[PDB]
């Protein structure tokens, strides 16, 4: 080897991690600036810069605040920003960028998905293009309320008009149409490619189509329209056209630079060193809060597959969107020139009078504006948006309709009572729902009327009894978790609408380490009784069962109560034995069928409340 | 409001005003385009006086060929239905071929009987010129000539509107001899004028030439009543489109329009007619109907065939599943019930990953380069503190951009805080004492894996396994959900968060949020993170490119749906630019994409002899999926020892074999015997104050 | 591609050009169009396209018909870089088809 | 002004900052170029300690290579002299084949003898770094090595500026055996 160069103290970053396993101030002090420097006066960090005790840090809508070397932060959900970037990337909820070219027209945002009551569904169509060409365009059609609104060729098309036109508006502001369909919808459209969508926190958890599930969590975001996610975004948005005759995306291989520069050099890097431009300085603030590398992505893709000829808009209209992701992190970035994607207002100076020159451009303005349209201020997602501002001395105000400034007055225009029997005290209850084909659907349902009756009898809430639902069919779907704070109206209305599975094969053992492991994983209620229905209507095959005893003796230790509720002939009365001989209040239930559930259903939440103590 | 042109029958042709005629053509003639400026062409083609196909031209940058037998090219290269491209959408509306031009104000139809159709919208009215007429109310003047003048023979209209290719030119065509009358067969054209249904459209469309047209194509006929069918199928059509849809027409009359197999024919069938995997979008659907073809009443479309609403199936991955059948997703399961799928919900376990020049993968699937040098908390259970992992990364190339892990240290507090190091070779130290393995001591094992590299488990909930040359794969059970922490991220199955840091606050930048997690002050804060190191060394560029795109071959398109190809192709990449020997990390590339396959459960046989075969040692034979649960000898020794391991690639003795520690392939016969930790030879016998044993067969 | 540089570039026979059209011959002009746009396939500026286009309308021009042909969605220019100023803004600069070239400063 | 940078001789080499040394290559090595960011790559070519052509690439869109026996390929592909393309020129300037930059800022020649020769300019003046080292007029700093060390053996130094490709990989070069 031929080398030719040359307990642990603790600093204020590492003072949580462990020791460098490669080899003093006092107890209570940290080394920090070259000296010893005592504890709860370590700074913070972030974005690589310390910030003292005390001191805060905006972080969208949410706020954080230095104490003890940790960021306390507040925990509002902040508007979320579905966006097209591009001709073919879409960028959820979530955050999830990806690619997906397509002829057809999709869904871009719909509520009217799973059991939620739909009120909006918004589609979007690709026009001129599928891979990105200079001739193309999009349309968004907006079917809010029964309504329709139609975005095209850079105007707005009311189709049909909404139940309440007050919650509906329309503002024109600099390059982009505003849009605000209610409370807590809203769409900005740069009327050429880039559609976003905002949504209020209201819509968590309900909304879904290519902008994926808002819900802060990226990796499901592909879920199929089927329910099912996928790997491969083509897929998924295969699975979301609205027309089903309409053709497919093909998955195309994935070379490392689209068609037009896999076979073109100078070209490829051409199209590089220009993208870059979200490297250089007037972006190199906002790369510290935004990460360029996805729409340097965007871009690269778009200006190979466009190759345009007079106007330069893939790539002016890429470069937008970030400066926009950008302005909408408070980082107002200055990157039009008169050489590199230049725009000019002066159409709407010059006019019969002669020049007249209120209108400039201006890098963001504020998006709302006051206007002989609009005389009162309105609330609207955007603070700040790129366009041509009208510019005009104090107490006089735009008119859109002149596109002019004008005087003000020139403007042209719980429930005990549910049944006899309440269980008011400290239970967590677990359902475990056999989803083999040995069940029917209709016998699934009568079995889910079982459920939802017996959580009408039980106080449901985080106090006093909480319940859980889960279905195995080979693996353990859960619909319902115990720390899940929604209403008890909602939850029984979540059990009332389980699905039906129907697998050949339910393994009863998984469903035991399921519950175990994962449902039990930390007894946070050690004072309440702990409780699962092992209901069950099917065998599992030997090799399976191996470890059946194994999970419930562990169940057991932790002292979670097992009550198995076989039901029918193909019920595996060995297993429902087997956890009857661990303890003697894991008493069985042994069922003619489902429908006998209408009849046991009295003694066995007097026994599940017999089981449980009060507060 | 939109025209429509027909060329219907064995040689009969509709003009977009009403002008109707025979031409039994024997080229390619003009159907409809712009008259004076064309920007598209639609060509009726010809042979032996019969339709062959019906074909579009955008203005000589693109043609499509829709054939009668359902055949479709874009220029020579034949394609499949559906199809959509440059605004051209190609789909089997109602069981008759559609090609629709939206964009370019017109769609053209073929029915299952070689009909052509095509509606031109109102924006080239009196602008249009071809076999289909102007359009222009007038229709007296529908026969205008290519070059501008009126004839009152259809065929030198016809004959003027040809068109010649390089392959075909055309010959003058000229009216066919024929016989011409059957009283019989002539009542069935009658049926035009005394029929009640047909009776409705008289006010909007004038029977007599249709009567005309259907007597004289009986004359031509060479068969029974059906002869007449083509006459009333286009009055039929020509009453829907100026409004009157004359339901009852296929009862009362003989006739019955050609429909594919199962489906039946229907007046003012809805074009958004519904298959399976269909969104229950209803709303959308502001098109009037048209005839055509529809599945039996309560059946349902899938793929072009009729299917009951219970028995069609769910789609993934392109592939379509019955009802009833499961998918697997590691550990969770999908069944199929009605169109979707019913899926498990369950946490399955966590895998980070460091496989090469500083490539990560984050516990929730986050993929990640970092290339800091310093000792840096890889994976450590923050909130029971059960174990403590951390890598020393040190730069392992000239280059600035290569830097690998050369050691791996894991703490285990619970055995007494004992301190693992996984070393560069694959060596294992213990509290520094260095080990002989396999090693086994309360919870702890550590072994060898058929690969050579070291396997680590603690308990069933921690599990590792280290190559020695820089690969560290970490498997923890979903016991350890959520309360992880390090460079691995919280393993919450939420890719958003893994840029965590101590702080609480989640960094943009993979530089800052690595350099929270190093462990030694005086170590280097990573400035910037320089992807592509191809620009340092330009020459490596192009087998960079032409080596790693071997993961998009179809050598691995078996794998594309199960694991996403570009994080690895990108580190694929970026390894063979940066590293030492670029064949070596291009090997190891393809073994991390192959492994996530394997992981998946798709095994790809990518090795070859260009690349990346293992040459095992001695003897041994390398196999793409063998058991190691009884290659060594030690197996022998302890066979109560439960095994239950899946099978892997690697080097393993012949099946009559065992392994010694020499790595020797013996029989059974000659294995040593491993008592209390000591090695005995075969046939060896001892005996002691207690025991009496003796060493045969390896036990 | 090819047909699309063909149909932007038949700008140079535009309602806009159609009266330079008589005075002058747009066709070499159209030929430098179409191998200059095919060569370059720019970027982020359209500077190849536009320059052609504003060529044609420079001989145009001296042939006495000036020609408005910059619109916002085609080869803009902006001239409001030098209006902006340290006292804020003054709109003294604006962009013409054509000016007087040799003024007097 | 402008730096100069040689290599000449069997297996000697001289610094644009005066450093002098010998090196007897086996692999190609970087001669001089943009040292954090890599806009263009001089690299030499040696072969059993000899060199055998003076190549250029201008950020792997394109790659030149001049051979001391007049020969130029574009990538793989033979082309003749004089050559023009993408900036670079190359020349029988003087009866020796010259490799002209301007826009990049360098100027390369091989002389009938197979000496390279490599002029920079000031742009480069302590931006750079490769066999021709730094450029710095201090010349003891010259031996930084690709790691960003300073090193007292030439070797090393060399060594640490090889590229490898995928048809050739590079050994680690060592003096040779001599009679002094
Ligand atoms: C964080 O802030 C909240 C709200 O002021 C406060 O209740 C809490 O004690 C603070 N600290 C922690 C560790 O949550
Ligand atoms: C752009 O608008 C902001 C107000 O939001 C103003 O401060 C700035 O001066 C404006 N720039 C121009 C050029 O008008
Ligand atoms: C039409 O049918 C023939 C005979 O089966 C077949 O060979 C051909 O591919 C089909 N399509 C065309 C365009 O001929
Ligand atoms: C149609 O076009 C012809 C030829 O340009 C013209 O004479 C006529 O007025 C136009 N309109 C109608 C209704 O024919
Ligand atoms: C090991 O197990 C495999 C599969 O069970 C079997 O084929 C083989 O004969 C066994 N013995 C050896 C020495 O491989
Ligand atoms: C351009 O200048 C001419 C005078 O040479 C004037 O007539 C014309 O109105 C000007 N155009 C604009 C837009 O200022
Ligand atoms: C150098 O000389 C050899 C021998 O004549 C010749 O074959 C070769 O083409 C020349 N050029 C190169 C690059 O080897
Ligand atoms: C050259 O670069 C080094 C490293 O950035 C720097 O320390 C030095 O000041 C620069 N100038 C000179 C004259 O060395
Ligand atoms: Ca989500
Ligand atoms: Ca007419
Ligand atoms: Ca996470
Ligand atoms: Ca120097």
Same mark, same amino acid.
């Given at each position: ?49 310390? #910030? ?53 027209? #999709?869904?871009?945002?719909?509520? #009217? ?104 969590? +990226? ?141 400039? #451009? ?20 955007? +603070? ?154 099917? +065998? ?58 209408? +009849? ?16 | ?12 042709? *509709? ?15 003009? $159907? ?21 196909? %019906? ?12 054939? /009668? ?20 959408? @190609? ?11 939206? =964009? ?13 159709? /095509? ?20 229709? !007296? ?5 290519? !070059? ?10 016809? *004959? ?10 055309? &010959? ?35 029977? &007599? ?5 259907? !007597?004289?194509? %009986? ?16 009055? =039929? ?20 329009? /050609? ?22 979008? *209803? ?13 039996? !009443? ?93 890598? &020393?990364? /040190? ?43 396999? @090693? %086994? ?48 991220? *919280? ?55 032409? =080596? ?49 396959? =394997? ?36 197996? $022998? ?63």
């Amino acid at each position: 080897m031929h080398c030719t160069m040359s307990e642990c103290a603790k600093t204020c970053q590492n003072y949580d991690l462990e020791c460098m396993s490669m080899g003093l101030c006092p107890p209570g002090m940290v080394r920090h600036e070259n000296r010893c420097v005592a504890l709860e006066r370590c700074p913070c960090f972030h974005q690589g810069k310390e #910030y003292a005790p005390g001191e805060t840090v905006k972080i969208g809508c949410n706020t954080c605040v230095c104490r003890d070397r940790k960021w306390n932060c507040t925990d509002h959900v902040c508007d979320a920003t579905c966006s097209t970037i591009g001709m073919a990337h879409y960028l959820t909820f979530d955050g999830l960028k990806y690619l997906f070219p397509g002829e057809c027209q #999709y869904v871009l945002v719909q509520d #009217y998905c799973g059991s939620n009551p739909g009120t909006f569904r918004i589609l979007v169509g690709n026009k001129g293009c599928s891979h990105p060409s200079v001739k193309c365009k999009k349309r968004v059609t907006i079917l809010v309320e029964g309504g329709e609104i139609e975005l095209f060729d850079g105007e707005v098309n009311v189709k049909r008009p909404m139940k309440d036109e007050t919650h509906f508006e329309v503002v024109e502001s600099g390059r982009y149409i505003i849009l605000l369909l209610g409370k807590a919808l809203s769409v900005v459209w740069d009327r050429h490619l880039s559609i976003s969508v905002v949504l209020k926190q209201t819509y968590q958890e309900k909304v879904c189509g290519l902008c994926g599930n808002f819900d802060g969590i +990226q990796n499901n975001d592909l879920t199929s329209s089927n329910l099912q996610v996928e790997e491969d975004p083509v897929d998924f948005g295969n699975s979301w056209k609205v027309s089903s005759q309409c053709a497919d995306t093909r998955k195309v291989p994935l070379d490392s630079s689209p068609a037009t520069c896999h076979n073109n050099i100078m070209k490829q890097t051409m199209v590089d060193s220009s993208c870059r431009i979200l490297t250089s300085d007037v972006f190199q603030d906002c790369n510290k809060l935004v990460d360029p590398e996805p729409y340097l992505d965007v871009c690269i893709y778009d200006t190979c597959s466009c190759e345009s000829i007079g106007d330069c808009a893939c790539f002016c209209d890429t470069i937008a969107a970030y400066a926009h992701v950008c302005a909408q992190h408070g980082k107002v970035v200055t990157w039009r020139t008169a050489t590199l994607c230049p725009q000019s207002c002066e159409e709407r100076n010059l006019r019969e009078n002669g020049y007249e020159c209120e209108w400039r #451009y201006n890098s963001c303005a504020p998006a709302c504006q006051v206007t002989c349209q609009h005389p009162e201020p309105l609330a609207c997602p955007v +603070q700040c948006v790129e366009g041509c501002h009208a510019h005009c001395p104090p107490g006089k105000i735009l008119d859109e309709l002149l596109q002019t400034c004008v005087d003000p007055e020139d403007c042209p225009v719980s429930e005990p009572p549910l049944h006899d029997f309440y269980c008011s005290r400290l239970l967590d209850l677990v359902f475990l729902l056999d989803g083999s084909s040995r069940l029917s659907e209709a016998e699934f349902e009568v079995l889910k009327a079982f459920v939802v009756d017996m959580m009408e009898r039980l106080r449901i809430s985080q106090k006093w009894v909480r319940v859980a639902v889960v279905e195995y069919h080979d693996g353990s779907h859960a619909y319902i978790g115990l720390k899940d704070r929604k209403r008890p109206s909602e939850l029984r209305r979540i059990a009332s609408q389980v699905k039906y599975a129907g697998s050949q094969v339910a393994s009863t053992s998984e469903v035991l380490k399921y519950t175990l492991f994962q449902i039990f994983s930390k007894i946070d209620r050690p004072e309440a009784s702990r409780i699962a229905l092992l209901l069950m209507a099917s +065998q599992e095959p030997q090799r399976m069962s191996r470890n059946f005893v194994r999970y419930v003796q562990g169940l057991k230790k932790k002292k979670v109560i097992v009550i198995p509720v076989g039901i029918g002939p193909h019920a595996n009365l060995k297993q429902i034995r087997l956890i009857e001989k661990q303890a003697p209040e894991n008493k069985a239930f042994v069922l003619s069928s489902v429908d006998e559930l209408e +009849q046991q259903r009295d003694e066995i939440v007097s026994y599940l409340c017999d089981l449980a103590p009060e507060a | 409001s939109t025209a429509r042109c027909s060329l219907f029958g064995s040689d009969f042709v *509709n003009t977009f005003d009403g002008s109707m005629y025979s031409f039994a053509g024997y080229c390619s003639y003009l $159907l409809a385009g712009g008259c004076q400026k064309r920007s598209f062409s639609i060509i009726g083609d010809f042979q032996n006086g019969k339709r062959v196909s %019906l074909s579009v031209y955008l203005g000589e940058f693109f043609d499509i060929h829709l054939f /009668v037998n359902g055949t479709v090219t874009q220029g020579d290269q034949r394609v499949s239905m559906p199809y959509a491209s440059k605004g051209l959408y @190609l789909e089997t509306e109602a069981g008759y071929y559609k090609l629709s031009g939206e =964009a370019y104000g017109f769609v053209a139809r073929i029915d299952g009987s070689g009909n052509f159709q /095509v509606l031109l919208s109102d924006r080239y009215f009196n602008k249009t010129c071809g076999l289909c007429g102007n359009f222009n109310i007038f229709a !007296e003047d529908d026969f205008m000539t290519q !070059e501008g003048t009126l004839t009152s023979d259809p065929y030198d209209f016809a *004959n003027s509107w040809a068109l010649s290719s390089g392959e075909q030119w055309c &010959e003058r065509a000229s009216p066919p001899s024929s016989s011409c009358m059957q009283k019989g067969l002539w009542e069935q054209c009658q049926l035009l004028k005394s029929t009640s249904v047909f009776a409705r459209c008289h006010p909007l469309v004038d029977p &007599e030439p249709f009567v005309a047209l259907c !007597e004289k194509t %009986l004359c031509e006929c060479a068969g029974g009543l059906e002869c007449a069918c083509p006459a009333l199928l286009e009055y =039929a059509r020509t009453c829907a489109q100026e409004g009157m849809v004359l339901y009852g027409w296929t009862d009362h009359s003989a006739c019955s329009p /050609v429909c594919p197999a199962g489906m039946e024919y229907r007046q003012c069938v809805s074009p958004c007619a519904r298959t399976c995997q269909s969104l229950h979008i *209803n709303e959308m659907c502001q098109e009037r109907c048209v005839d055509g073809c529809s599945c039996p !009443e309560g059946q349902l479309l899938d793929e072009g065939l009729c299917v009951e609403s219970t028995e069609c199936p769910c789609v993934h991955s392109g592939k379509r599943y019955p009802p009833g059948t499961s998918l697997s997703r590691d550990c969770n399961t999908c069944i199929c019930r009605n169109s979707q799928w019913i899926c498990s919900n369950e946490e399955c376990p966590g895998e980070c990953l460091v496989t090469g020049q500083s490539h990560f993968k984050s516990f929730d699937n986050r993929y990640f380069t970092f290339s800091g040098i310093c000792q840096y908390l890889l994976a450590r259970d923050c909130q029971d503190h059960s174990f403590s992992i951390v890598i &020393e990364t /040190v730069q392992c190339a000239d280059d600035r951009d290569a830097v690998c892990t050369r050691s791996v240290t894991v703490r285990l507090p619970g055995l007494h805080n004992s301190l693992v190091k996984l070393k560069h070779g694959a060596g294992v130290a213990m509290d520094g004492q260095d080990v002989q393995l396999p @090693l %086994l001591k309360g919870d702890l094992r550590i072994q060898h894996t058929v690969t050579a590299s070291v396997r680590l488990s603690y308990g069933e909930d921690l599990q590792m396994d280290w190559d020695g040359r820089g690969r560290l794969l970490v498997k923890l059970s979903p016991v350890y959900a959520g309360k992880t922490c390090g460079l691995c991220g *919280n393993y919450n199955g939420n890719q958003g968060d893994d840029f965590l840091t101590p702080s609480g606050l989640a960094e943009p930048r993979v530089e800052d949020f690595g350099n929270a997690w190093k462990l030694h002050g005086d170590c280097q804060d990573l400035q910037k993170q320089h992807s592509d190191p191809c620009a340092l060394n330009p020459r490596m560029t192009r087998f960079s490119e032409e =080596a790693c795109a071997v993961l998009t071959s179809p050598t691995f398109e078996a794998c594309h749906r199960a694991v996403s190809p570009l994080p690895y192709l990108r580190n694929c990449r970026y390894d063979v630019c940066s590293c030492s020997d670029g064949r070596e990390c291009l090997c190891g590339a393809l073994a991390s994409y192959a492994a996530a396959c =394997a992981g998946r459960g798709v095994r790809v046989a990518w090795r070859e002899p260009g690349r990346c075969e293992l040459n095992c040692p001695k003897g041994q034979v390398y196999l793409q999926c063998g058991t190691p649960c009884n290659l060594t000898c030690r197996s $022998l020794s302890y066979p109560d020892e439960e095994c239950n391991e899946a099978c892997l690639e690697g080097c393993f003795c012949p099946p009559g074999l065992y392994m010694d520690e020499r790595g020797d392939c013996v029989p059974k016969a000659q294995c040593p015997c491993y008592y209390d930790g000591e090695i005995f030879q075969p046939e060896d016998i001892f005996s002691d104050h207690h025991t009496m044993c003796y060493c045969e067969d390896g036990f």
